[PDB]
């Protein structure tokens, strides 16, 4: 029930507003003289969606192969008393064994971090057994809403991963893999 | 259950981050030469929380006595892949019968607009009977979390109103009333 809400409020309150735009984000950045012909930024927002853990804020400390590159242009909007709502995203370079596969506008779905916090907040009453179905149904609902919303289904790709045990998991390869897919 | 999540994710994902700061927002704006001694902006974020209707985006069209004044300084942060998350708020002037009672940093709680949208989204399965308990428990949970979070309890005031029938309701007086309260 909780994850359901957050997925709807993430789409309606954020994606539903910035997915129809943001094409010029990677248009101006890739054609900037200080990076002209140095990787063309991809046409979509790659959302990192962990499934077992709380979302980290810094990508460098999470995966060494992940490296902060730069920040793309900012935006504006009339949002609940904010006639100029600034939207900003940060570009990252996927460096797999020194070899940089590429760079794209990247960010984690923030509502996923909030539904993890809820489990260690005894007032919210969210339990760790439900947690699994929560983070999962947040990605599921975000995939399901993106299906019924074709104007949002494109312009964004979802990167979900489950790494509970050790299998040299790398959240950096998942991205490079998803970019080459289509 | 849904409203519960949104209130937690609004605090943890937005208020819990910008309430400890934002004091300098009204400090620099009130002392700007183009407004020096023309109303000192209040020290808190006044959140508009309707209880029966969907939040409007524009305040002018909602209440004539409400009038857009200006926008305050912007902010930055390390948020899920965004090393510079821009936070921006807009100041409004409460004009009651020509007489401007004052001006303060104002905005509607955006998660309230999303929980209304959910009622007319048959996929989300949210019903209009629950809607009442939803919008209500979103404000209730936001008041309850602000009680257990003293570092956030201050620096913000909640303005909840229920106007289903006609009683010349004015969402402009509610604000001026709340500012003089303390
Ligand atoms: C209304 O519902 C949401 C709006 C946004 S906007 C947003 C970002 O831009 C990503 C930056 C970040 O989150 O770090 C994420 C969400 C997620 C939700 S789901 C409800 S819980 C919540 C509410 C809230 C309000 C925020 C505002 O800045 C106010 C303006 C607005 O919402 O349009 S951020 C935010 C984050 C939330 O949970 C993650």
Author numbering:
A (entry chain A), B (entry chain A): 154 to 317, 319 to 336
Provide the authors' own sentences about this structure as they appear in the paper:
While other dimers were inactive, a thioether-containing covalent compound SCS2, formed from N1 and E4, induced the interferon pathway with an half maximal effective concentration (EC50) of 0.71 µM; by comparison, the MSA2 parent molecule had an EC50 of 15 μM (left). Because thioether linkages represent a previously unexplored chemical space of MSA2, we synthesized a series of sulfur-containing dimers D1–7 with systematically varied lengths to gain further insight into their structure–activity relationship (SAR). Three-atom linkages appeared to be optimal, with D2, D5 and D7 being the most active compounds in the THP-1 assay. Either shortening (D1) or lengthening the linker (D3) by one atom led to impaired cellular activities. Further lengthening of the linker (D4 and D6) completely abolished their activities. Interestingly, their binding constants to purified STING ligand-binding domain (LBD) did not seem to correlate completely with their cellular EC50, a phenomenon reported previously. One-microsecond molecular dynamics (MD) simulations indicated that thio-containing linkers with four or fewer atoms benefit from more favourable interactions (for example, CH-π with Y167) and greater numbers of hydrogen bonds. Well-preserved interactions with residues such as R232, R238 and T263 were observed (right).
